[PDB]
Symmetry: C5
Subunit: 103 residues, 5 copies
């Protein structure tokens, strides 16, 4: 199994790593339908989203996606420092595939 975020991020297509080593700057949640979306930004301006559960989301991928939203909401409120983000760049804002937080 991959030991970290980088080697984990190289296993998929259309993914790229971003080293933020910074705390989330803003958190946006929308419950307005078809856009069950969470959007975060950092101070430099970089925006990322947690992609809405469309049909390309199994039922094992719905749970992991909800978890990701929880992780971001709490990482935001606790001001936790996010290290790197492995993101799908074929979408805009870049959809988050993985996250690592390090003190």
């Amino acid at each position: 199994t991959p030991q970290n975020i980088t080697d984990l991020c190289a296993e998929y297509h259309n993914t790229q790593i971003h080293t933020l080593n910074d705390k989330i700057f803003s958190y946006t949640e929308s419950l307005a339908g078809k856009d069950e979306m969470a959007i975060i930004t950092f101070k430099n301006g970089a925006t990322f989203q947690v992609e809405v559960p469309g049909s390309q989301h199994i039922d094992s991928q719905k749970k992991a996606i909800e978890r990701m939203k929880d992780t971001l909401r709490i990482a935001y409120l606790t001001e936790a420092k996010v290290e790197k983000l492995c993101v799908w760049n074929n979408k805009t804002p870049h959809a988050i595939a993985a996250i690592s937080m390090a003190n």
Copy 2:
């Protein structure tokens, strides 16, 4: 995909942004019949609610409503500054469609 709440907001009907830049002043929760609701108010007098889960709402929308209540509860408790709120102005208290928090 909208990069923020202002855009995310203008995407629906009867929606309206509301800048707050204030923490939630009060949080009310009620489990009394068909009105399982949460009400939040700010120091300036503004009172918003999270709609009641029912009829129109399917599945992904029924649990986004649950996440929204969780988000408001932990935001009230942690005294997080809510920047803006996209609210459905056709309801009273104005229902919440989206929220953004910053820093």
Copy 3:
């Protein structure tokens, strides 16, 4: 729609508002069969309980009841000042129907 716990409490059957403006003094949780219950008391001796999840009431009513127990546990742990409680008087200890928190 009522815009606060007092008004909201006025729409139901034999409910009563108790103003506390204090934090919860103790929280008791019991998983002992049939009487799955949560009890809270304030330093002033007042005692309240969240009603146990009957099947005869809808499932959204069971999710509300579960949320309420989370809210009380987290309110107790963080020492949130509870403003008012809207409870049903036809029970003993009195069953909570709504709660407001504010500083």
Copy 4:
């Protein structure tokens, strides 16, 4: 309904109240199959457990059991003072039936 934990602990067979008035010293979680367990200890050496949600547990029972493990984890992590524990003294360690926390 019982209004305190000592009353309540008395409605059952083979129960026994312990007063700790102390925080949880350690917390042990395990997912190693059929042994889905939580184990808490206090400085005085006492050890308690939350029973595995077996396939003889009623509907609500499994869910109250999940709640009790969430409570112990959060109590441990926040160093919340545990007042008394109502345990069944016929298991090793004593299975927890109810918990009370007071400042």
Copy 5:
């Protein structure tokens, strides 16, 4: 029956207890399909993971798995000291079986 992470760890196969007595150094969460994994690291470099679901793990095993992920997440966010880890040494990185936390 067993009362601590050690006894409990010695009742399964391919398990070894790891004494860490330190806080988790980094936390990595991944929602990228079939790689829905949680990987933690400690200061010395030691890496562990929580085994992704599947039909090998009964639904109750899926739940202890989800619970273990939440525990790892708040422990990291709160900087709780993790004492010992009981891990399956037959995989790489070693898969976590039980965790003990002690202040």
